[PDB]
Amino acid sequence: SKVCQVTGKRPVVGNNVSHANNKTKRRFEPNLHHHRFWLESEKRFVRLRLTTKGMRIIDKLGIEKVVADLRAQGQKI
Amino acid sequence: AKLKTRRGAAKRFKATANGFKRKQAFKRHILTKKSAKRIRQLRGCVMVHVSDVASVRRMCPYI
Amino acid sequence: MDVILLQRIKNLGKLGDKVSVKAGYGRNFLIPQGKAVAATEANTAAFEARRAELEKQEAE
RNA sequence: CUCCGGGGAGGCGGCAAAUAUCCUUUGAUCCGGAGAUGUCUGAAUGGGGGAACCCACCUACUUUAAGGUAGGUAUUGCAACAUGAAUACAUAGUGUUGCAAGGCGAACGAGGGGAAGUGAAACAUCUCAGUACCCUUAGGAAAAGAAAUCAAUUGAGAUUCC
RNA sequence: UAUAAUGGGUCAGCGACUUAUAUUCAGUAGCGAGGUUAACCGUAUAGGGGAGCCGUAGAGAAAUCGAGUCUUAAUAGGGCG
RNA sequence: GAACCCACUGUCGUUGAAAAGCCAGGGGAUGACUUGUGGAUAGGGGUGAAAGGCUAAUCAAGCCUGGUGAUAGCUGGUUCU
RNA sequence: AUAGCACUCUGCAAACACGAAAGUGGACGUAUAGGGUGUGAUGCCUGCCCGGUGCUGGAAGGUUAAUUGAUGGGGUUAGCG
RNA sequence: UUCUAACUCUGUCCCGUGAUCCGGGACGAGGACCGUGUCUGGUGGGUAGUUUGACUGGGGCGGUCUCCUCCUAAAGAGUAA
RNA sequence: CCACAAGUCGAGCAGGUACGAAAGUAGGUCUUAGUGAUCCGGUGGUUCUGUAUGGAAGGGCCAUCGCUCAACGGAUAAAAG
Numbered sequence: 001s002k003v004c005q006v007t008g009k010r011p012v013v014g015n016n017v018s019h020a021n022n023k024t025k026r027r028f029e030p031n032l033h034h035h036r037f038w039l040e041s042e043k044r045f046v047r048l049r050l051t052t053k054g055m056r057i058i059d060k061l062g063i064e065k066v067v068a069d070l071r072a073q074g075q076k077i
Numbered sequence: 078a079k080l081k082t083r084r085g086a087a088k089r090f091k092a093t094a095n096g097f098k099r100k101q102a103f104k105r106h107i108l109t110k111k112s113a114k115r116i117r118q119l120r121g122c123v124m125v126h127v128s129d130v131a132s133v134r135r136m137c138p139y140i
Numbered sequence: 141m142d143v144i145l146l147q148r149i150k151n152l153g154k155l156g157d158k159v160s161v162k163a164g165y166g167r168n169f170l171i172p173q174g175k176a177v178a179a180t181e182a183n184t185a186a187f188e189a190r191r192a193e194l195e196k197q198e199a200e
Numbered sequence: 201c202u203c204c205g206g207g208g209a210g211g212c213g214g215c216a217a218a219u220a221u222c223c224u225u226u227g228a229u230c231c232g233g234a235g236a237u238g239u240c241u242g243a244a245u246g247g248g249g250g251a252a253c254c255c256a257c258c259u260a261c262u263u264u265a266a267g268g269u270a271g272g273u274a275u276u277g278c279a280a281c282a283u284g285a286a287u288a289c290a291u292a293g294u295g296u297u298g299c300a301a302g303g304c305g306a307a308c309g310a311g312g313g314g315a316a317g318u319g320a321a322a323c324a325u326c327u328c329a330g331u332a333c334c335c336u337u338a339g340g341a342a343a344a345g346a347a348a349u350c351a352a353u354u355g356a357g358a359u360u361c362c
Numbered sequence: 363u364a365u366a367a368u369g370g371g372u373c374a375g376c377g378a379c380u381u382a383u384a385u386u387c388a389g390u391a392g393c394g395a396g397g398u399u400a401a402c403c404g405u406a407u408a409g410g411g412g413a414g415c416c417g418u419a420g421a422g423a424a425a426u427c428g429a430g431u432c433u434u435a436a437u438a439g440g441g442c443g
Numbered sequence: 444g445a446a447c448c449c450a451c452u453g454u455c456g457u458u459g460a461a462a463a464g465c466c467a468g469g470g471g472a473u474g475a476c477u478u479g480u481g482g483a484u485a486g487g488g489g490u491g492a493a494a495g496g497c498u499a500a501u502c503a504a505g506c507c508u509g510g511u512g513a514u515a516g517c518u519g520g521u522u523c524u
Numbered sequence: 525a526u527a528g529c530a531c532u533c534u535g536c537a538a539a540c541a542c543g544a545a546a547g548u549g550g551a552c553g554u555a556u557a558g559g560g561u562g563u564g565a566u567g568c569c570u571g572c573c574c575g576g577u578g579c580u581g582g583a584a585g586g587u588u589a590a591u592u593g594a595u596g597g598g599g600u601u602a603g604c605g
Numbered sequence: 606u607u608c609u610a611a612c613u614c615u616g617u618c619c620c621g622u623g624a625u626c627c628g629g630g631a632c633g634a635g636g637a638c639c640g641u642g643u644c645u646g647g648u649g650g651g652u653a654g655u656u657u658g659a660c661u662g663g664g665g666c667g668g669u670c671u672c673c674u675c676c677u678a679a680a681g682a683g684u685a686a
Numbered sequence: 687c688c689a690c691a692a693g694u695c696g697a698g699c700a701g702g703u704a705c706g707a708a709a710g711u712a713g714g715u716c717u718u719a720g721u722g723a724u725c726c727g728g729u730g731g732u733u734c735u736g737u738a739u740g741g742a743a744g745g746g747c748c749a750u751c752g753c754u755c756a757a758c759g760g761a762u763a764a765a766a767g
Binding site for chain 9: 100101103107112113116120
């Protein structure tokens with residue numbers, strides 16, 4: 001399903017609101033996509049399904065820290 | 078449950094000692110063509126008519 | 141992003157210069173291929189602290 | 201069916217009488233507590249299947265004939281051990297053992313989705329209503345909870361319910 | 363509507379202005395410029411519990427005044443009391 | 444032109460032998476044919492050599508259970524002196 | 525409905541259809557193929573109109589969205605009075 | 606205009622592996638395009654909820670809908686088509 | 687005059703004013719048609735209010751502006767068969 005591995009983001013529900021104030025159900029979806037990251041400590045590429053905010057967090061903290069954190073939550077990377 | 082006030086009527090009527098007071102219509106706009114006497118005599122509050130007092134009481138049970 | 145160049149680059153700078161590059165450039169080319177490192181405090185401590193002279197006389 | 205305790209003149213459950221064999225003061229029937237046995241289907245878990253059926257494998261003991269008795273054989277997750285590619289180290293993968301889970305069931309709890317009939321004396325904003333319903337999942341309750349909270353004489357002092 | 367307008371073949375049994383809360387008026391009882399407690403406690407219809415509510419003052423949109431007040435330059439006039 | 448598959452005309456039947464038939468005639472009958480068994484498509488959907496046809500004797504939106512005691516300025520009814 | 529005819533779309537991970545997606549039909553096909561639309565064996569044939577609506581190809585002038593944020597006008601107060 | 610390193614391949618080869626799924630590896634062809642998320646303009650009976658007045662010698666069509674003057678109006682006021 | 691909401695006539699008092707020598711006359715035009723409630727906003731003033739306090743924003747009061755709401759007491763800002 002559409003879940004970001006780094007942040008846990010998922011689609012949420014909301015409304016389309018028209019000019020006459022008609023309200024209809026809608027969904028907001030994350031900016032999800034697949035990306036390969038080079039893990040040097042393991043000499044391999046890891047493929048993650050994540051968002052652009054996930055990429056920003058990886059840029060901030062390093063891929064090793066993020067991968068260790070995700071493993072600590074029971075994610076089989 | 079508790080009786081509920083009709084808020085629209087509550088915004089139009091207030092209680093006096095022996096009745097209800099109200100403002101007068103026809104003073105919101107289109108005022109240039111009206112005579113000075115009508116302008117100054119439609120200004121201020123008057124009393125609610127006895128034929129409408131009962132309806133006002135049912136609409137505003139607590140004032 | 142801000143990076144410290146591990147080894148010489150044609151236009152960025154030479155052997156330890158700190159430069160700002162577009163995020164994609166560093167994320168996809170420099171960092172995975174070992175031509176630069178992120179300019180964090182720990183990575184800086186690592187770069188000037190010990191391996192600076194090693195990177196230096198590994199000029200080629 | 202067994203043991204222990206209670207009880208003391210009858211009893212062999214009911215529809216449901218009747219009869220025969222009988223049991224019982226050497227303590228019956230009956231009552232309470234603790235054990236033993238407990239076919240097949242069903243989460244059903246050795247494989248399959250139109251539920252209560254069809255077909256099996258391995259190990260040990262036993263029989264002499266085409267068997268019997270006892271045990272083991274599901275999946276997933278975790279851990280240990282062994283093994284192990286592309287590919288050199290490794291990794292993926294594979295196997296064994298041990299542990300755990302699945303299913304059912306009233307209401308109450310928490311969370312993920314979420315109408316319309318109706319009212320507005322028409323109807324679209326609004327209402328109905330976060331209701332009905334669907335889904336996931338606890339506990340004897342749950343949730344919340346110890347101020348980046350309120351108040352406005354500078355005062356109160358976590359949460360929950362009336 | 364005798365109507366050729368509706369309903370009933372007949373009998374027996376069942377079958378339709380309720381309940382809760384709030385409010386106004388009438389009757390009745392207690393107390394009376396006062397009346398009354400709610401949740402809750404309570405070997406519990408008692409006794410405690412006065413927070414709160416209604417009445418005792420009105421005028422003005424309001425600040426404000428108050429047997430007065432609003433309007434107004436006005437102590438005039440006028441409206442609500 | 445028989446079996447088999449259809450359904451053009453007429454009488455009968457219409458509280459039927461039958462909730463669609465009998466009888467006398469009629470059309471196709473080696474093909475775009477008829478048929479058994481077992482499967483697939485599910486309700487604003489399916490399928491349709493197309494009639495809004497068919498989807499369990501039900502179809503301009505199947506059936507069942509819930510919202511639900513929907514709403515009805517309409518019709519009926521409303522019991523002793 | 526039909527064989528026949530015509531227009532049109534589609535260069536293949538085809539157009540098109542089902543589905544939320546994964547994927548599936550088209551098709552284990554490849555413009556002599558596949559989808560949509562109309563006409564309806566065959567004979568003789570199929571005239572005029574591009575003003576309207578649609579489709580196809582141009583053009584870069586006018587108008588216009590999010591985004592961006594130049595200027596101008598107010599609120600507050602250190603200070604000056 | 607070049608490039609590769611994000612990203613694409615319903616292209617070839619190798620392995621998991623007894624496998625036209627999938628995953629990993631090696632190539633090849635593409636490539637900052639395509640494509641997806643948020644926002645935003647256009648199009649949008651494909652789909653959905655609804656609206657589409659009253660008087661009236663039946664309804665529809667036609668006419669009318671508010672105000673002023675005269676008559677009907679029966680010597681006060683009022684009085685319908 | 688009148689269901690309401692509205693509509694009509696008005697002597698007289700105070701302030702300022704115009705024309706008259708003066709007593710005086712003048713609160714639109716001989717009169718009866720020339721019209722639109724409420725809501726929502728705009729503008730000019732204002733000794734009202736101002737969510738800790740001082741301001742301010744916003745609101746109130748007085749004057750005034752925007753409807754062929756003509757189905758003219760006006761069901762929506764927004765509707766044909």
